[PDB]
From a paper:
Phage portal proteins are key viral components located in a single pentameric vertex of the capsid and they act as initiators of capsid assembly. They are also critical components of the DNA-packaging complex and are involved in tail assembly. The structures show two conformations—open and closed—of the portal and suggest a possible mechanism of the channel valve that regulates DNA passage.
Several X-ray data sets from various crystal forms of the T7 portal in its dodecameric (12mer) and tridecameric (13mer) forms were collected. Although the portal protein is always found as a dodecamer in virions, assemblies containing 11–13 subunits have been described for other portals when expressed under non-physiological conditions. The T7 portal structure was finally solved by combining cryo-EM and X-ray crystallography. An initial map of the tridecameric form of the gp8 protein at 5.8 Å resolution was obtained by cryo-EM (gp8-13merEM). The ring-shaped volume allowed the ab-initio building of a partial poly-alanine model composed mainly of α-helices, which contained 36% of the structure. This partial model was later used for phasing a 3.4 Å resolution gp8-13mer crystallographic data set by molecular replacement and a full atomic model was built into the resulting electron density map (gp8-13mercryst).
Author numbering:
A (entry chain B): 3 to 48, 55 to 494
B (entry chain A): 55 to 199
C (entry chain A): 399 to 448
D (entry chain A): 250 to 349
E (entry chain C): 449 to 494
F (entry chain C): 350 to 398
G (entry chain C): 250 to 299
Write the structure that this text describes.
């Protein structure tokens, strides 16, 4: 069947069209990668760098973020939905069974992420997210309990179109598979479409995903050499598309995202250009060249051949050694280079932005400057929890629930709330409030045996101000007199 | 074109980061409490009161759950940057509409306009989107040709 | 303004289960009050130390 | 549902002022200077030989020499072009730094 | 839990609930952390 | 020096510039731990499992 | 039982990148410089009478 809508005139033809507005982004990504790690986004179409600062910064930033966002620890938290949680009012037996299945679900997701090598690709994705605007993550249908890894498309080989509100209208990926590696059906279709193909010839395979105007849901198909692939068609519901295009830095009303490094590219290239001319300098400067005056007696052969300790026919007025003596010029260059590199280290939260060789670095300023690095990391992290973490989890839930790898739970826990960050680590806001109230209560120990002060009321008021539940914090009359008797 | 120095870049970035962690943290950040007038009514009625405070600090957690689930933090960040560099930002939050992914919309100063009265209340606004024809809704698309 | 609006939008779509009149127009604290490190707590535990 | 926000108010006016605007002077000053400084560092780090063509020392023979090599020439013919704007720099640096 | 030693002999504070709540926020199993009624009164007797 | 950070050589701490404090040693050492945790958490997925 | 391992993945590619590659520029630089310096030290240690 000929399909229409956004897929009216072929997948490849859409890819081609949308590529036009994507181009700036991939130029920008190519420039940033040039001065860090070029293999992330090479300057092929529309060699290593001199300095390694870009390289170790990017590597650092990714590592840090990946150990924050996706640690070996449990990192999401599923909890009962607010509405259904109001239902199980005065039903602890029926509740605590919900939370048991939810925290089971937690563990299943975790076991999946562990066993399908999600961490490794997430790393590569973070690098990409940092250097270029965007990554496209694709997680296929679980399909058994097999090794189901994730797939990553770097900005160069995929394309996106968003509406007014930033919702995804259509996507087109473009794999480049060698003919030999293609499935037989596809392989046969291709050569049956004319011209016999060599095993090492590469074949563009376009994958089109798009919103249908009629259905409130996505359609997908694969498309090779202008013809749709046999049984490559499919559909995805709007709220759970397994293709996730991620932006690092949003500009609303725009299909792709800006990148992190781009903001600090000015100072990065500046460093690169300088570090080059300095290294070259040092090379001229470490080269010894003698100068025998040919008007003199001292003959150069006789010098080169000499053993150490040797007396040789000559005068010292004939030989001189070519001195560079660009000694001051160097320290000006160095001072600048150093300044910039220092500025970059802060932007890559390298811990050795503390390392200043100027003065005796106190201990007290270290804590303050290290908390400027924590400040700016909290920034990217709290943005990448929304952008990368929550969508990845939300989609994994729906995917696993579809294949009944998630044993049936009671209605309450089908749409739970997904906590991430410090809550899940078990170091959250609730615990803090509780153990700040305990420390506030211990400060009325020097009046425990009160004359007429009434500890009960003050005890409850402290908890209220701080904001603990205080649902069964105070001992009731019947339970207190019961405990007074025993 | 990029700038020669990155002091401004890290400066703005710092400022926004700090502000956004202060204004919109993962913690609860608003607090809803009984109105002064109606609170005077429930004088000597604790049982009837702390039920109000119970439904309110429910409301808190609902708003919070929405802000978490609808990516409010990420757009607030971009808005704070905008707010610092250009004088003003425009936030648009559409009708919840089911229980779906309803994000917020941001209009930079360049693509919206405002007129205020004497007392500074809003009289009119006019935003200006710039959509590719292909992305438009079919009804509009067909009107346009 | 952000909060005030959300309240009115959520109460419109009855994504906010009905509460008794008192809590339809409440007062919206922000800042330190909410964090649980406010003026009230300070005054209390300054009175305990006195 | 449309909320137009201002950063810094000026009463009786539809739009708001910005935070950075207040400090723009010192910011553009910085940007002008750090430019002129960066460019300085590129001049200063560039080696350029000067072989006196009245002389004996021929430049082809200097560029082709290995390290350790002895070569026909006199050190009155080669000189390396020095920028020595060492003091002028630290003036510019002092000011840049003060602003930063 | 060692931080509520300066109020172990509580007047009307209820250690039981706060002890379980701390464990929940941290996120231990709490599957048989509290002493049950029959097992507690058994231990009080012995 | 730069390469020593990249190879997590402990003696990237060793700077002859200044009297190296005790408090910065810890902080710079944990840059090396940071970047080691990086390669390790990858190679655990790539090589170990 | 054949396990081919990659260090640094590039999705859609059969072989992996290396860890050192990312820092090779600074490494060859050192090698070149250290060579010219060691060679300097042999010229500097050599006594020749005239």
């Amino acid at each position: 069947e000929k399909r229409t809508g956004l897929a009216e005139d072929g997948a490849k033809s859409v890819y081609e069209r949308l590529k036009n507005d994507r181009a700036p982004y991939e130029t920008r990504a190519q420039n940033c990668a040039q001065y860090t790690i070029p293999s992330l986004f090479p300057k092929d179409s529309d060699q290593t760098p001199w300095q390694a600062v870009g390289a170790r910064g990017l590597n650092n930033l990714a590592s840090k973020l990946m150990l924050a966002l996706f640690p070996m620890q449990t990192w999401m938290r599923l909890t009962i939905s607010e509405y259904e949680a109001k239902q199980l009012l005065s039903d602890p037996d029926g509740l605590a069974k919900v939370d048991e299945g939810l925290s089971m679900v937690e563990r299943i997701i975790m076991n999946y992420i562990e066993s399908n090598s999600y961490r490794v690709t997430l790393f590569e994705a973070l690098k990409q997210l940092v250097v270029a605007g965007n990554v496209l993550l694709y997680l296929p249908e679980p399909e058994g309990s097999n090794y189901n890894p994730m797939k990553l498309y770097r900005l160069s080989s995929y394309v996106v179109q968003r509406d007014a509100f930033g919702n995804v209208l259509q996507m087109v990926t473009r794999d480049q598979i060698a003919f030999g590696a293609l499935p037989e059906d596809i392989r046969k279709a291709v050569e049956g479409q004319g011209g016999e193909k060599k095993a090492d010839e590469t074949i563009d395979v376009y994958t089109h995903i798009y919103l249908d105007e009629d259905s409130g849901e996505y359609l997908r198909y694969e498309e090779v050499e202008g013809m749709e692939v046999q049984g490559s068609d499919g559909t995805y519901p709007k709220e759970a598309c397994p293709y996730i295009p991620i932006r690092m830095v949003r500009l609303d009303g725009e299909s792709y995202g800006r990148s992190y490094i781009e903001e600090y590219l000015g100072d990065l290239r500046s460093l690169e250009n300088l570090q080059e001319a300095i290294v070259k300098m040092s090379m001229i400067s470490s080269k010894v060249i003698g100068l025998v005056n040919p008007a003199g007696i001292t003959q150069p052969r006789r010098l080169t051949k000499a053993q150490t300790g040797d007396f040789v026919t000559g005068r010292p007025e004939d030989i001189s050694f070519l001195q560079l003596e660009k000694q001051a010029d160097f320290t000006v260059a160095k001072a600048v280079s150093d300044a910039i590199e220092a500025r970059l280290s802060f932007a890559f939260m390298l811990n050795s932005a503390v390392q200043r060789t100027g003065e005796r670095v106190t201990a007290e300023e270290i804590r303050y400057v290290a908390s400027e690095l924590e400040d700016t990391l909290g920034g990217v992290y709290s943005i990448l929890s929304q952008e990368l973490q929550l969508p990845l989890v939300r989609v994994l839930l729906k995917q696993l629930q579809a294949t009944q790898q998630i044993p049936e739970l009671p209605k309450e826990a089908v749409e739970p709330t997904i906590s991430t960050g410090l809550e899940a680590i078990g170091r959250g806001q609730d615990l803090d409030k509780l153990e700040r109230c305990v420390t506030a209560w211990a400060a009325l120990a020097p009046m425990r045996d009160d004359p007429d002060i009434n500890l009960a009321m003050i005890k409850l008021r402290i908890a209220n101000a701080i904001g603990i539940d205080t649902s069964g914090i105070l001992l009731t009359e019947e339970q207190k007199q019961q405990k007074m008797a025993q």
